[PDB]
Design a binder for this molecule. Structure first.
Ligand SMILES: C[C@H](CCC(=O)NCCC[N+](C)(C)CCCS(=O)(=O)[O-])[C@H]1CC[C@H]2[C@@H]3[C@H](O)C[C@@H]4C[C@H](O)CC[C@]4(C)[C@H]3C[C@H](O)[C@]12C
Lengths: 176, 179
């Protein structure tokens, strides 16, 4: 991997499926001036709970209020992302999305983000917080097969922005 | 190496073992290994800068509630690039004077930065707050890496729920009611 805290998030250009249903080649740099929640999940339909994408799609406006763009990703092609989008969510599909879904079928974005199982060719679950300047602020990687909490993720973005503005909430030990 | 941009720590693999001198809760030094906790979950905090750069209340809050992790068959361990005597000095300084006071958890020393290297958390460019949390399960397998430079104290409650989620899912599988 190249992803590293305090450095620019590795930039990719990739095909995404956009909220309007269309394919568009996008880059993380497109969102400079906004915080970004970028999350990797293993595989459409078979190795992820639909609701961990749905809960972020549903609540995307809570994120846009914080000036934050949410983007999902997996090693799936854009064709497979679109198929899951066009599967109804009462059929355990995604249904229509308020957020873009990046495709990584060559596995090079997952490798670059340091979340690839090279043998299996699927990512772990990864959460990346990237600030309005494009700088990587958090990495979480795990193999925990439950959905990420939207509330917690909002709170985290809020904590980063707060401390961006105000400095340390929990002061360093040397400080008077 | 790792899938990680640095270190040898890899999700789904044995956590890198280390043998290092620890200051134990009562203040004795003991040379310990991560393998000493096989059979238990471990919550491993690593501070890649010495404790003067760290918010003592973060570590204190975890030490204070260590019994709650012990109930979950989980050992909390804190580690930093401090020497073992530095750690002893910190715990032997009362909180009221800005120290740590007595801890309910071991503090592991990494003055040679070999644990830091192995765990992918050598200090570099980042905010001064850069530090890591690692979740190791009772088989010794690394289950989570979180790293960030957020100068806010980590939540004990969230961490407890995290450990319980790992443990729940270890025994009952994936969680997806609507899947
Ligand atoms: C400079 C700071 C003090 C800064 C400070 O003023 N911290 C604010 C806390 C005040 N609060 C009211 C918020 C405390 C909360 C009250 S409560 O009791 O509720 O926790 C003090 C606090 C503890 C200190 C170190 C330790 O001794 C260990 C060691 C002893 C050696 O010989 C000399 C080196 C070393 C590293 C010491 C250096 C330094 O000297 C430290 C960082």
């Amino acid at each position: 991997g190249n992803a590293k805290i305090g450095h620019p998030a590795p930039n990719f250009k990739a095909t995404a499926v956009m909220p309007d249903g269309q394919f568009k080649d996008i880059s993380l740099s497109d969102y400079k001036g906004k915080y970004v929640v970028f999350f990797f999940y293993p595989l459409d339909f078979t190795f992820v709970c639909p609701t961990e994408i749905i809960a972020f799609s549903d609540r995307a406006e809570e994120f846009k209020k914080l000036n934050c763009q949410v983007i999902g990703a997996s090693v799936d092609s854009h064709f497979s992302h679109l198929a899951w989008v066009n599967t109804p969510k009462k059929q355990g599909g995604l249904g229509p999305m308020n957020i873009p879904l990046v495709s990584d079928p060559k596995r090079t974005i997952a490798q670059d983000y340091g979340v690839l199982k090279a043998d299996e060719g699927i990512s772990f679950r990864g959460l990346f917080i990237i600030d309005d300047k494009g700088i990587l602020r958090q990495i979480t990687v795990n193999d925990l097969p439950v959905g990420r909490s939207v509330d917690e993720t909002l709170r985290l973005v809020q904590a980063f922005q707060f401390t961006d503005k105000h400095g340390e909430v929990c002061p360093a030990g040397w400080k008077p």
